[PDB]
Design an enzyme around this catalytic site. Structure first.
Site, PDB file in Angstrom:
ATOM      1  N   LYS A  23      -9.017   2.392  -1.313  1.00  0.00           N
ATOM      2  CA  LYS A  23      -8.443   2.551   0.026  1.00  0.00           C
ATOM      3  C   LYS A  23      -8.746   3.913   0.648  1.00  0.00           C
ATOM      4  CE  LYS A  23      -4.618  -0.390  -1.443  1.00  0.00           C
ATOM      5  NZ  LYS A  23      -3.159  -0.625  -1.273  1.00  0.00           N
ATOM      6  N   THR A  72       0.856  -1.234   0.000  1.00  0.00           N
ATOM      7  CA  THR A  72       0.000   0.000   0.000  1.00  0.00           C
ATOM      8  C   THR A  72       0.871   1.256   0.000  1.00  0.00           C
ATOM      9  OG1 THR A  72      -1.862  -1.086   1.157  1.00  0.00           O
ATOM     10  CG2 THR A  72      -1.814   1.296   1.249  1.00  0.00           C
ATOM     11  N   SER A  73       0.423   2.261  -0.751  1.00  0.00           N
ATOM     12  CA  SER A  73       1.027   3.587  -0.756  1.00  0.00           C
ATOM     13  C   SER A  73      -0.111   4.583  -0.644  1.00  0.00           C
ATOM     14  CB  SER A  73       1.815   3.828  -2.040  1.00  0.00           C
ATOM     15  OG  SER A  73       2.725   2.775  -2.261  1.00  0.00           O
TER      16      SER A  73
END
Ligand SMILES: *[C@@H](CS(C)(=O)=O)[C@H](Cc1ccc(CN)cc1)NC(=O)[C@H](CC1CCCCC1)NC(=O)[C@H](CC(C)C)NC(=O)c1cnc(C)s1
Ligand SMILES: *[C@@H](CS(C)(=O)=O)[C@H](Cc1ccc(CN)cc1)NC(=O)[C@H](CC1CCCCC1)NC(=O)[C@H](CC(C)C)NC(=O)c1cnc(C)s1
Ligand SMILES: [Mg+2]
Ligand SMILES: [Mg+2]
Ligand SMILES: [Mg+2]
Ligand SMILES: [Mg+2]
Lengths: 219, 224, 195, 212, 222, 204, 196, 195, 196
Positions: I33, I1-2
């Site tokens: 997200k 995840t970023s």
């Protein structure tokens, strides 16, 4: 243990405390931790005391044979290499933590050697359980190219910091001053603590202990 | 049982003739990552106490709220809340000490080392330590974590015993503290240049200094 | 193997050694002699790990018998015990150590004295008036502390030994199936067939 | 620790050592391993020092409440079972307790119950408990008979502790003796092993494994 | 994993005289090789002429001393300001300690004072509350260094009268308060010389019928 | 499990005025079980005395090993080994088993025959030398001996003053240790006489 | 540790921080992690100090002996000797080494040798604990055939960020410039790079 | 506790149970009765973990004795065994399970039949002609397979039981100090005092 | 995840990648997200998907009930509710959440809540596995009071690098713009951001 070294203008000043511990108990209050390598090179010792003693002696012996064959004084880099390469070979199991200091044809040099075989070349170093106490004194007050009596005081002050603040360190302060013109082995340099005076005499009088039998043999 | 995640390093302190000084850097480390560069870890309580906190930052923030709430609660039905019945350093400490030991005894500790520095009603210097185990002690110099190993040796050269406290001025004490903060910056891998310092004096009161920096840094010997 | 006792009296050494050989659940044998004659006046009883016991005892026996042939001479009990200790002391730092404890009961024909040596698997040698290995000693030493005298006869030694074996039969949890007893004196080694 | 207690013609003998250890550290050699619950009840202590001292003191309180409530001396059988049912409740928590509840009542005569921390409760004529039990059992079992006088029984108990005091590293210090009869218990002294050993050796002609 | 216990070092010493008692302790508090304080009092006046020290893990020690001091306060309230006798204090401490049998107060506790006949008393507790009245007791880090010396010099152990050669023991003569204080100071001087956790200062609390007096002495600081 | 405290026992050595003293207890055990009360821990090679505590099989092995080495030393050198030289020999010999050591606590004692100087020394199990003038202690009651020696000892004691000091140090230390005692021996060593005394002590 | 080697028009520049830690203690704050294995073949060292020192000394030896017999070795040859040691002793080593050198034929070359003992020839390389924080920055800002001043600024800015975020990195930024002109040592202090 | 046997013959059930009580190193007692009378015609022998055995047995006894008083009636051996099994089956999923194995030998006065139930600490009940718990069965079941007949007399049952105890005395490593034997028949429970 | 949230002149923008992995398998390549807890208070989620979804639903509930009684909650209030859950249940949660929201009084605000359950108010925040690679880049390129187009480009470039280096990150770059004007959803595909 608190061992330390500085590079000053004319050469090297090494320092050490004198407390030898087995666990929490003090076995020797005045033991020597500044070891002889060659006439121009000395080694302060911390970590496992036996490893420190026999590693310095072996390299000192080999350097003596090296120096007899070449006919010239040994160098600090060769002492550093021989210690380094051996400790590396034994992968940290020889628990020798050395401050190596001496004066060559190429000038004064100071090293810290670690059990695993790494070495740092530095103007000041500290090792042992009292390294942080001693290093605080050096970070506070060290400057390059100090005079002799100043450097002596700084090292003595750094060892003292270890003696008082670290429980593993104690006893007297030993120094070793190395320059081109002299080697001064100062043991003890300072006695910062007086031996505690006892108020009573607890020694028993003759015939107090109960003996079963006796035997005398002359020599 | 937990593990500390975002952490604060050394809090250092000492007594001097009229009061106490306390200091701590402004870093919140996330392991080796120097994550948060603007974290205040000295938290004043009233005008006579500063609580310096190291260790887990989330637990620090919890303690910060407890102290903030303590001030509110002390004010309730208390006409002398800003006078004779104000919060004392000793009260604030004892509370925290009670909390810390209670939490360790439920096996769910607040993962911190705390130094409560302040001045009491009668002018007495208060300086006492408490940690995640409920262990408490007082000394003319106190330091947490890394500072115990490097700051205390330097600070003890100024005040080695109780009898040296009246001989130590606020200038000498503050110099010593700032000097020690420099030494810690050179040598503590989880410290920062930017710090806060707080003097609590019995005459001049609470002085809170923000955005200080370590200066006069000797690097020139590196080039060789 | 379980219980091995030894007692040195006036003019002899008596070694009592259990007969049971148990492998886990079952008692495989109830007539096992846990001893080897090393020389005519030196007997070694043994107890410890399965296999290792006999292998060690037979190995020692072979070496002492070789010495006896080479020099046409019997080594003193002291010498045999020192040889055995060194073999065990060598063993303990091996790849796989001998887990064997021994008692060496011998009559020194030169000094006209019985001698009892107790050696454990580490090579811990001691000369004793009476000895035991394993749990046996916990019960038996206090009896022997009480009753032993250095000037006892061989019959008095055997009575004192019965009292040890009765106490072991009463208070020990394992059925060791009684003991074979052997006497070592000036005339050699003989087995007491009724005990 | 070495505690023993045995039944004979003229009552019960109870003998204990006096040493307390923390590993190899001799912490004390003047320790009380017998609790006097009442004029007719004794408790010996082996295993954990606190666990014995505490729960056997507490036993004495429960024995008192019985005789207040019931106007009658508590039976040894009942006293021993208060303690055995108690420790059983704590079973698996790591109590260490090896004890003997010795006493007299008209109803049961002289009686000894062995009670331990893992729930076992046993009536018997002879018991030895402690790290030196085996050493005591050896001497005791081989000189015992109902026949014995009070003088010989007292001595045999004294001697069986001495035996264990010698061989067992964790036993020693001194021997505390008790004699329990129909009229109650009677203390028969504290005998330092330092002096008792050399006396017993000289007078009895035993302990020839020793230089002296 | 969280370890709820720690070791703050320290060493304490109780000695019971004929009509007095002393409880001494070094003032150094440590963790590992660091000194926390060179002066952190460890032996406390608890009221009713009882002095107490709970040496070991300082947090558990402070907790216990605090609870006992409070136990003294509530004994006064509940029993018409009656003096808590040293033997009663001891039993009360057993129950405090045993209360935490399955999560112990990691401390060696010693109390000192006078019994109900006016004679000197010392009581000594293990961490889970087994206890006994003793004439002599050192506790903590350097207890193994001190107790043998006290066996030799207080109780005259292994000492016999010259000329008799092992036949007559040296008689057990009573020690004065000045005599006992010499033994305490020299015991701590010896312990300081040979144990790294002992030093900085010695604080002695002396209990007599007149009350609780204090004496302080410097110890070697390295 | 811990090899240094299976068998138990102690050694202490002290210096005096023109003399040394070395002493040991007599116990050998298997942990709680006492086995022998005639297990002496002091040996001698000429005028140099060696006490050895620890694992008894190694005590025996090292004694036999130093007898071996000092015998060859004497044959080659044509003189008895001195305490200073022997101390170095012990250190060497221990350190050559650095990674599989003898579980022992040796103590050297003797008077240098040429200089007349009283000498003692001690070692850890891998041969680091404790080189102290005052006293050396070793064994399962070493802590106890350290305490006794530090409070009882003073420098330049006459032989029979020193006897009382070392004996009381041993006895009172041993009585606070479960694995030491069962008798004791004290050697008083002078430049040309050695007095060996067995001590009366409690047998528990 | 934060280390990098960057090729540019005139040759190659190696760069490194100077911090060596024992846990949280900075054992050496003026460490020289740029070590010389030949006149114009240097390496950046990361991992165990004992291992990378031991390797670099052995490589120096091999290349000294190569030079005695076959003349100046290629940068590729140096990288191959490093690799051979790192790969064959992978189970007993923790060494992440960047090898950089200047030939006249090949000009600047950079070889990275990560933990496995694999070799990767690259225009630039980054390594050490502090390198994670500058993958984004270095990828966005690197260009080929930069000038000397541009490459010094690229390395200075990159390691400045690596130092800022990584606690394991710090102290002075040392650099070593490798061109036809010779070997130039540069140093940059905190007061200079922190204000970037 | 170690060996508990049971054998159901024509007109009775015979329970043999070892006398030894061993705590680790020492045999603390050699006359222990590992049984409780639950009702006049129902006997339960037991073996398992120390403490738990007697606590369980006495607890069952108390409950059956309570039932007997409440209803002025003796529960059948089948009913008592089912009660005991449920108590053990409840126990096994507890915080701390009873580690106790039992044999319930009873005479059903209604059916005029002896009955032997074998129940383990899990609550595993089986009615058998002969039973054992622990290692005993490994030796004894093959004997009983050979020699047992359903129409045997009580004296024949006791002889067959002697043969079981002899085999156990020969081949088992632990000295269990002999067995107390008890007979459960129409006339109640009695102890064979010579065995 | 970023994931990241960045304050700017007109308010605040949240940004996130769309990759969710089970080890090396990409279970969902189009994950959202960025989740809404109130009209103009959103959060970026990293850590356990089960934990962050469970938390975000509980927060949404709390703020819905807050709104019923006390009107629109502050972004600080939302962050406090997130913190309270994350801190009190720290032993059973793996959640790294950035909270971002637009008041008219306070304008854009960003709060980061890392694993411990501590709260940190910041001008911008980065988080998730891919965030390590862009600390250098984001510190060098962030300015305060950027325009909407500048902040979209700052986030697009930053997450583009995070995605490039982090295997755990990838797919589309989703963004959510929070200003007085309203709520705008943006999406940027690989063919657009990879060529930057
Ligand atoms: C201080 C170093 S410190 C506290 O920082 O580890 C001293 C250094 C030293 C150097 C030379 C000499 C004289 N030749 C004396 C002292 N080191 C020590 O005192 C040793 C510290 C130990 C710390 C625990 C880990 C082992 C090293 N102590 C020893 O080496 C002693 C030897 C003395 C003289 C009795 N040995 C032991 O304590 C051992 C215990 N078990 C071993 C295998 S070694
Ligand atoms: C001998 C029993 S033995 C050697 O067979 O386990 C004595 C019995 C005893 C009985 C009553 C009293 C009255 N105060 C004293 C002693 N037991 C002991 O000496 C205890 C031995 C332990 C061996 C390990 C298994 C537990 C028992 N000793 C203790 O209980 C000591 C007592 C101190 C030294 C006064 N306490 C500790 O060992 C503790 C260690 N850590 C703790 C939290 S308590
Ligand atoms: Mg003993
Ligand atoms: Mg000290
Ligand atoms: Mg003793
Ligand atoms: Mg940094």
């Amino acid at each position: 243990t608190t061992i330390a070294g500085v590079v000053y203008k004319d050469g090297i000043v090494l320092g050490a405390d004198t407390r030898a511990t087995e666990g929490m108990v003090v076995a020797d209050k005045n033991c020597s931790k500044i070891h002889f390598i060659s006439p121009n090179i000395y080694c302060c010792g911390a970590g496992t005391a036996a490893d420190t003693d026999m590693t310095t002696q072996l390299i000192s012996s080999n350097l003596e044979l090296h120096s007899l064959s070449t006919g010239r004084l040994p160098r600090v880099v060769t002492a550093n290499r021989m210690l380094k390469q051996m400790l590396f070979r034994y992968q940290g199991y020889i628990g020798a933590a050395l401050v190596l200091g001496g004066v060559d044809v190429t000038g004064p040099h100071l090293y810290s050697i670690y059990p695993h075989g790494s070495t740092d070349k530095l103007p000041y170093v500290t090792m042992g359980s009292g390294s942080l106490a001693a290093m605080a004194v050096f970070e506070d007050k060290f400057r390059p190219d100090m005079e002799e009596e100043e450097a002596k005081n700084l090292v003595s002050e750094a060892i003292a910091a270890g003696i008082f603040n670290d429980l593993g360190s104690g006893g007297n302060i030993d120094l070793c001053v190395i320059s081109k013109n002299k080697l001064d082995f100062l043991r003890p340099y300072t006695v910062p603590n007086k031996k505690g005076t006892r108020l009573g005499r607890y020694r028993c009088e003759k015939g107090t202990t109960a003996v079963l039998t006796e035997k005398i043999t002359p020599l | 049982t937990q593990q500390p995640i975002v952490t604060g390093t050394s809090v250092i302190s000492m007594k001097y003739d009229n009061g106490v000084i306390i200091a701590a850097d402004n870093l919140g480390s996330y392991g080796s990552l120097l994550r948060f560069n603007g974290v205040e870890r000295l938290i004043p309580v009233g005008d006579n106490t500063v609580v310096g906190i190291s260790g887990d930052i989330s637990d620090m923030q919890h303690i910060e709220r407890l102290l903030k709430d303590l001030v509110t609660e002390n004010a309730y039905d208390n006409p002398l809340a800003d006078a004779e019945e104000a919060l004392e350093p000793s009260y604030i400490f004892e509370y925290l000490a009670t909390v810390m030991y209670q939490r360790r005894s439920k096996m769910n500790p607040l993962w911190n080392a705390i130094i409560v520095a302040g001045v009491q009603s009668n002018g007495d210097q208060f300086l006492r330590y408490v940690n995640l185990l409920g262990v408490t002690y007082s000394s003319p110099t106190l330091a947490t974590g890394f500072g115990a190993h490097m700051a205390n040796p330097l600070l003890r050269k100024v005040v080695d015993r109780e009898s040296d406290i009246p001989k130590t001025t606020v200038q000498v004490a503050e110099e010593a503290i700032v000097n020690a903060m420099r030494v810690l910056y050179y040598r503590d891998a989880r410290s920062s240049r930017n710090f806060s310092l707080a003097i609590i004096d019995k005459n001049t009161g609470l002085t809170f200094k923000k955005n200080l920096q370590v200066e006069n840094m000797k690097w020139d010997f590196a080039k060789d | 193997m379980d219980i091995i006792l030894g007692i040195r009296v006036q003019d002899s050494v008596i070694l009592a050694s259990s007969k049971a050989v148990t492998r886990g659940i079952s008692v495989l044998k109830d007539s096992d002699d846990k001893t080897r004659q090393l020389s005519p006046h030196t007997l070694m009883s043994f107890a410890g790990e399965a296999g290792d016991t006999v292998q060690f005892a037979e190995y020692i026996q072979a070496n002492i018998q070789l010495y006896s042939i080479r020099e046409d001479y019997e080594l003193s009990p002291q010498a045999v015990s020192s040889f055995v200790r060194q073999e065990l002391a060598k063993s303990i730092r091996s790849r796989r150590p001998y887990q064997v404890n021994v008692l060496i009961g011998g009559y020194d024909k030169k000094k006209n004295k019985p001698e009892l040596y107790q050696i454990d698997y580490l090579g811990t040698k001691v000369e004793l008036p009476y000895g035991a290995h394993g749990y046996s000693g916990f019960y038996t030493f206090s009896l022997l502390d009480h009753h032993y005298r250095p000037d006892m006869t061989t019959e008095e030694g055997l009575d004192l030994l019965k009292l040890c074996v009765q106490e072991l039969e009463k208070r020990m949890p394992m059925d060791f199936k009684g003991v074979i007893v052997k006497i070592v004196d000036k005339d050699g080694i003989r087995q007491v067939d009724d005990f | 620790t070495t505690t023993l207690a045995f039944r004979f013609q003229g009552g019960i003998i109870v003998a204990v050592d006096s040493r307390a250890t923390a590993g190899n550290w001799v912490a004390s050699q003047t320790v009380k391993k017998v609790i006097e619950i009442n004029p007719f009840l004794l408790g010996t202590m082996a295993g954990g020092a606190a666990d014995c001292q505490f729960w056997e003191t507490w036993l004495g309180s429960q024995c008192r409440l019985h005789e207040l409530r019931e106007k009658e001396r508590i039976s040894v059988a009942a006293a021993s079972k208060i303690l055995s049912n108690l420790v059983y409740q704590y079973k698996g928590a790591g109590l260490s307790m090896g004890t003997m509840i010795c006493g007299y009542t008209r109803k049961e005569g002289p009686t000894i119950y062995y009670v331990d921390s893992d729930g076992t409760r046993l009536k018997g004529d002879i018991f030895c408990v402690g790290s030196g039990q085996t050493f005591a059992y050896g001497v005791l079992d081989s000189n015992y008979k109902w026949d014995l006088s009070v003088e010989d029984a007292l001595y045999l108990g004294k001697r069986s502790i001495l035996a264990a005091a010698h061989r067992d590293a964790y036993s020693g210090g001194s021997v505390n003796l008790y004699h329990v009869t129909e009229d109650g218990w009677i203390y028969h002294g504290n005998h330092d092993v330092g002096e008792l050993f050399w006396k017993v050796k000289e007078e009895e002609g035993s302990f020839n494994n020793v230089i002296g | 994993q969280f370890n709820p216990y720690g070791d703050n070092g320290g060493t304490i010493l109780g000695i019971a005289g004929e009509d007095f008692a002393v409880l001494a302790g070094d003032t150094r508090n440590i963790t590992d090789y660091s000194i926390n304080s060179r002066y952190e009092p460890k032996v406390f006046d608890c009221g009713d002429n009882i002095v107490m020290s709970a040496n070991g893990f300082a947090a558990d020690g402070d907790a216990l001393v605090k609870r006992f001091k409070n136990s003294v306060k509530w004994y006064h309230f509940d029993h018409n300001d009656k003096k808590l006798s040293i033997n009663s204090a001891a039993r009360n401490i057993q129950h405090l300690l045993y209360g935490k049998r399955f999560f112990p107060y990691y401390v060696h506790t010693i109390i000192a004072g006078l019994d109900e006949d006016g004679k000197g008393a010392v009581y000594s507790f293990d961490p889970v509350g087994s206890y006994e009245r003793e004439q002599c007791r050192a506790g903590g880090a350097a207890a193994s260094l001190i107790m043998p010396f006290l066996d030799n010099q207080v109780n005259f152990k292994n000492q016999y009268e010259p000329g008799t050669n092992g036949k007559v023991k040296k008689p057990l003569k009573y020690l004065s308060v000045e005599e006992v204080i010499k033994l305490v100071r020299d015991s701590f001087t010896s312990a300081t010389e040979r144990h790294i956790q002992v030093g900085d200062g010695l604080e002695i609390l002396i209990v007599t019928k007149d009350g609780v007096r204090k004496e302080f002495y410097e110890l070697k600081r390295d | 499990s811990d090899p240094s405290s299976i068998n138990g026992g102690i050694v202490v050595a002290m210096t005096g005025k023109d003399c040394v003293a070395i002493a040991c207890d007599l116990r050998l055990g298997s942990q709680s079980l006492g086995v022998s009360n005639k297990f002496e821990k002091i040996f001698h090679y000429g005028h140099v005395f060696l006490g050895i505590t620890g694992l008894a099989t190694d005590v025996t092995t090292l004694n036999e090993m130093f007898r071996y080495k000092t015998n060859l030393y004497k044959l080659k050198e044509e003189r008895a080994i001195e305490p200073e030289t022997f101390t170095q020999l012990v250190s060497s010999s221990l350190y050559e088993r650095r990674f599989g050591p003898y579980f022992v606590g040796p103590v050297v004692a003797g008077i240098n025959s040429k200089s007349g100087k009283p000498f003692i020394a001690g070692f850890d199990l891998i041969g680091c030398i404790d080189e102290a003038k005052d006293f050396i202690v070793s064994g399962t009651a070493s802590d106890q001996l350290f305490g006794m020696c530090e409070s009882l000892y003073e420098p330049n004691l006459e032989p029979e003053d020193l006897f009382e000091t070392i004996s009381q140090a041993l006895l009172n230390a041993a009585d606070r240790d479960a694995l030491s005692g069962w008798g004791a021996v004290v050697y008083i060593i002078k430049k040309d006489e050695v007095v060996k005394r067995y001590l009366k002590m409690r047998q528990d | 540790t934060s280390i990098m080697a960057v090729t540019f028009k005139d040759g190659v520049i190696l760069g490194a921080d100077s911090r060596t830690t024992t846990g949280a203690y900075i054992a050496n704050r003026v460490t020289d992690k740029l070590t010389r294995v030949h006149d114009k073949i240097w390496c950046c060292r990361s991992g165990s100090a004992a291992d990378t020192q031991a390797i670099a000394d052995i490589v120096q030896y091999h290349l000294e002996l190569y030079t005695s017999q076959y003349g100046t070795p290629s940068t590729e040859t140096a990288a191959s000797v490093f690799k051979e040691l790192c790969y064959e002793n992978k189970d007993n080593l923790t060494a992440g080494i960047i090898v950089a050198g200047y030939d006249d034929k090949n000009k600047g070359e950079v070889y990275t040798i990560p933990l496995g003992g694999s070799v990767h020839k690259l225009p630039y390389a980054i390594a050490g604990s502090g390198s994670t924080f500058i993958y984004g920055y270095c990828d966005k800002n690197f260009r080929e055939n930069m000038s000397k001043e541009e490459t010094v600024d690229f390395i200075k800015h990159s390691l400045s960020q690596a130092i800022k975020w990584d606690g394991s990195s710090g102290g002075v930024i040392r650099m070593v410039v490798l061109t036809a002109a010779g070997v130039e040592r540069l140093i940059f202090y905190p007061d200079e790079y922190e204000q970037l």
